[PDB]
């Protein structure tokens, strides 16, 4: 029942920033992998 993390920039602490950092990486791995497979198969 507490949404402090939604108040201004309170929710942007270190745990949350690390979590986002990992998100950017995981999605960045896909782009590399998805684009590498797409060039093996020969598609759009």
């Amino acid at each position: 029942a507490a949404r402090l993390h939604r108040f201004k920039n309170k929710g942007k602490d270190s745990t949350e920033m690390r979590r986002r950092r990992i998100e950017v990486n995981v999605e960045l791995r896909k782009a590399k992998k998805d684009d590498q497979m797409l060039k093996r198969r020969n598609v759009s």
């Binding site: 029942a1 507490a2 949404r3 402090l4 939604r6 108040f7 201004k8 920039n9 309170k10 942007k12 602490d13 270190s14 745990t15 920033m17 690390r18 950092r21 990992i22 990486n25 995981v26 791995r29 590399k32 992998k33 998805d34 590498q36 497979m37 797409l38 093996r40 198969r41 598609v43 759009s44």
Partner: protein, 876 residues
């Protein structure tokens, strides 16, 4: 000694005396648990014993049955179930017979009942429990303590057992709870307990809520309880209304108009914080439920069908009355601000942002007038509320409608950046940050950009409270500036952008802000570093000079750290030291992806060593390890095959990371690093594979590890196969069996915490097969020899994918990867695969679904796979 005498010693403020007593207890449990459990219960059940001994006795029991570690809890439960049913009975009687006999407030027996029940109930091993608690509560001659205790016990049971297993006892349990909540109950304490027990039990009361008879009965007792004089019952009953609103939104139209509206609105107006927060929460929750429903409606719309549930737009209809109430509450700030405290003021701000994203444009005409009337008010409380309210409505309304209102408001906003009140400056900084993020054109203007920058640059010197928001404002201004510049540069990054003229000034200031001695307040230092990372990343090419200078600065500070184990005095010193470590690595992760592949080569060696030592000595705190490993991945990405030079010295650290398993995020980083090493080193990673594979297999065969690691490992398996190709035949059998077992996985089609987890373990399997299939097929000519090894498994893969097409859970992510697999299978086995695909119909609709999907990749691959299957038909 005497057991009671030992129990009383567990409260001695003497370390050795506690140890002596604690050890005596631990070994009595080891020697004969059943008898130990029996003798403690006897102590707990006797009113003649001292308060101290009884409470201590209850503590020893609870700690024998439950734990915080789900793995240890399960172990204690079965250990308890293994006990002679004659022994357990004795304890159950003594424990249940204790209810009501305690003078001690928080009942010690309550926890025991729950501890035991959590083990017995799921196996109808204690059929006398429920009827007794019910009896205890309902009996008109039961004492207050008797009632409170029992209600407490019911509450512990509902909070600790899987709702899935009390679903058949919900009936009797609600009877006991509602009886305790009735208005005519003398004790407010009994009322409190019953009402808290109700909150814990709503999860398994779906069947009851479906009967209007019982529904009405529950809703009346609760609404009635929010009218109780004891503020504690008021608040708990309010909380029940919030959770009921979530769980049973669909049944609420009966009670909204006639009562919920009045109750919740009246609560928001309470001067009692506890109460005001519950009323505000109720509506923030309605907003959340309705925004989800709006998504369900929007989604169903594209599938050409009606949604499973429909909103009643309660927020839109309450909007008129909530806003005046919400904006006035923004007026209740706490001058002496504690940024870890949740009060009505903060809650009103958030509720306002929710109503805005929920009711979009409808809110503006209700909020602007309060903003206009008070933006110039001499009372800072009102001036602040006006800027806050303004910043709160920036997301949701149509940008075309806001832009003008934000343009005409810039002059006053800039003025507000220099307001004498700190509170006001704090808000104005956040509001500027939100404009840069949502309505950038109003900031990246030839009129306001300049005075805005000077205000933000000066703000970095202000109190932490202000400078922090200024850091975030800058980070979002940098993003908007980058986007507005490379809109069309015909190449990668833009040549320049509006922040170029003062890029050096900004980076210099952020670096200064980073070393402020008060940087620990309001997460200033972190924000300053996070803001610098975003400014560097989102920079124009002509800013590369300052970026190089900046990178040199980062490396320097990087070492100042390695040699900073001196100052670490108090425990908080070891923590803030760790933080810095992370920030620097994270800031490294950013520079490396911005530097010329040539620049990154001179830094590589010096940094690899810095990341090398930072891991060894600093074994404590995985957060550092996580950013240290992520930094390493970042380096590996830049260097490439060149990274090989270090692999020999980094092997041990790579292992450690994989062994950890106790800190899932440090292990997820390790696994993530393994995979990068594959795309980098390629076949050159063959020698290090036995180790990693051995370690990866162990992690999987260790059910204690956080479930979020398994799919990452499965995924990396597909990458390792691609990296070593044929040399993978060495692990094929093991991996396919593992993949075979994981692919059969399945949770409950209700728990969305799993329904989204299965689509993560599924995509990883598909991605593992795809990798394996591609790895063994070589690189060019017809299907290579190796892939034939997998030929016999082709059948299940298709079945797996077939079942996936079934469960209407999916995810455009799963659909895409499956489609890519069908395709690669057609290219690996040929004509055969066709007979197997037209057999499993569900695969045809899945590919069909892909062809639709607004996920370009889901389309591309589904469109591609279809083309491939089509070619097999028209082949032989």
């Amino acid at each position: 000694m005497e057991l009671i005498t030992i129990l009383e010693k567990t409260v001695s403020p003497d370390r050795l005396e506690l140890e002596a007593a604690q050890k005596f207890l631990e070994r009595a449990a080891v020697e004969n648990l059943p008898t130990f459990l029996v003798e403690l219960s006897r102590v707990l059940a006797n009113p003649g014993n001292s308060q101290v001994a009884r409470v201590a006795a209850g503590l020893q029991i609870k700690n024998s049955l439950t734990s915080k570690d789900p793995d240890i809890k399960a172990q204690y439960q079965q250990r308890w179930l293994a006990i002679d049913a004659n022994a357990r009975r004795e304890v159950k009687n003594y424990v249940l017979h204790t209810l009501g006999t305690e003078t001690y407030r928080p009942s010690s027996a309550s926890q025991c009942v729950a501890g035991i029940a959590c083990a017995e109930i799921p196996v109808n091993q204690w059929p006398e429990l429920i009827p007794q608690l019910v009896a205890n509560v309902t009996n008109p001659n039961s004492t207050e303590h008797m009632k409170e205790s029992t209600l407490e016990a019911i509450g512990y049971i509902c909070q600790d057992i899987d709702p899935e297993q009390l679903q058949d006892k919900s009936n009797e349990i609600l009877t006991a709870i509602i009886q305790g909540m009735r208005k005519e109950e003398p004790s407010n304490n009994v009322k409190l307990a019953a009402t808290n027990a109700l909150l814990n039990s709503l999860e398994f009361t779906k069947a009851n809520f479906d009967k209007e008879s019982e529904r009405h009965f529950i809703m009346q007792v609760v609404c009635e309880a929010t009218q109780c004089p004891d503020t504690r019952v008021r608040v708990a009953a309010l909380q029940n209304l919030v959770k009921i609103m979530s769980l049973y939104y669909q049944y609420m139209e009966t009670y909204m108009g006639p009562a919920l509206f009045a109750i919740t609105i009246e609560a928001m107006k309470s001067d009692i914080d506890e109460v005001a927060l519950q009323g505000i929460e109720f509506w923030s929750n309605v907003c959340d439920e309705e925004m989800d429903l709006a998504i369900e409606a929007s989604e169903a719309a594209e599938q050409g069908r009606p949604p499973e549930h429909t909103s009643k737009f309660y927020a839109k209809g309450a909007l008129q009355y909530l806003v005046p109430i919400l904006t006035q509450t923004l007026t209740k700030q706490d001058e002496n601000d504690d940024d870890d405290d949740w009060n009505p003021c903060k809650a009103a701000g958030v509720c306002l942002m929710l109503l805005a994203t929920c009711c979009e444009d409808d809110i503006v005409p209700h909020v602007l007038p309060f903003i206009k009337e008070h933006i110039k008010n001499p009372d800072w409380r009102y001036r602040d509320a006006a800027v806050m309210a303004f910043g709160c409505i920036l997301e949701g309304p149509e940008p075309s409608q806001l832009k003008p209102l934000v343009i005409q408001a810039m002059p006053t906003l800039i003025e507000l950046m220099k307001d004498p009140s700190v509170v006001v400056r704090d808000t104005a900084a956040w509001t500027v940050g939100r404009i840069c993020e949502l309505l950038p054109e109003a900031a990246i203007n030839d009129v306001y950009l300049a005075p805005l920058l000077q205000c933000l640059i000066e703000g970095l010197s202000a109190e932490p409270r202000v400078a922090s928001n200024v850091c975030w404002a800058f980070s979002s201004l940098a993003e908007a500036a980058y986007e507005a510049a490379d809109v069309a540069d015909d190449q990668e990054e833009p040549a320049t952008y509006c922040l170029s003229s003062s890029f050096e000034l900004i980076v210099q200031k952020l670096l200064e802000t980073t070393d402020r001695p008060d940087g620990h307040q309001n997460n200033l230092r972190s924000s300053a570093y996070e803001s610098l990372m975003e400014i560097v990343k989102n920079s124009a090419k002509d800013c590369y000079p300052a970026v190089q200078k900046t990178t040199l600065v980062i490396m320097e500070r990087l070492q100042q750290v390695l040699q900073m184990e001196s100052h670490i005095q108090s425990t908080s010193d070891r923590i803030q030291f760790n933080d810095l470590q992370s920030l620097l690595c994270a800031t490294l992760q950013n520079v490396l992806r911005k530097v010329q592949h040539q620049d990154a080569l001179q830094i590589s060696d010096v940094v690899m060593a810095s990341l090398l030592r930072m891991f060894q000595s600093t074994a404590g705190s995985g957060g550092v390890q996580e950013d240290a490993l992520m930094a390493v991945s970042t380096l590996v990405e830049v260097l490439g095959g060149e990274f090989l030079k270090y692999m020999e010295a980094f092997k041990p650290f790579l292992g450690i990371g994989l062994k950890n398993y106790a800190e899932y995020q440090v292990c997820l980083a390790a696994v993530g690093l393994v995979g990068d090493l594959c795309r980098a080193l390629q076949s050159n990673i063959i020698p290090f594979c036995d180790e990693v594979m051995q370690l990866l297999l162990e992690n999987l065969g260790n059910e204690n590890v956080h479930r979020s690691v398994k799919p990452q490992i499965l995924s990396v398996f597909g990458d390792i196969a691609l990296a070593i190709g044929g040399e993978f035949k060495k692990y094929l059998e093991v991996v396919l069996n593992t993949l075979q077992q994981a692919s059969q996985a399945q949770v409950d089609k209700s728990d969305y915490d799993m329904v989204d987890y299965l689509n993560e373990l599924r995509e990883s399997c598909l991605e593992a097969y795809t990798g394996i299939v591609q790895g063994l097929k070589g690189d060019q000519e017809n299907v290579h020899p190796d892939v034939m090894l997998v030929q016999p498994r082709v059948e299940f893969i298709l079945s797996f994918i077939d079942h996936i097409a079934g469960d209407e859970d999916h995810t455009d992510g799963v659909v895409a990867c499956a489609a890519g697999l069908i395709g690669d299978l057609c290219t690996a086995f040929g004509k055969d695969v066709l007979k197997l695909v037209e057999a499993r119909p569900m695969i045809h609709e899945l590919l069909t679904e892909g062809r639709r999907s607004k996920t370009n990749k889901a389309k591309t691959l589904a469109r591609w796979a279809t083309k491939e299957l089509r070619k097999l038909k028209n082949q032989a």
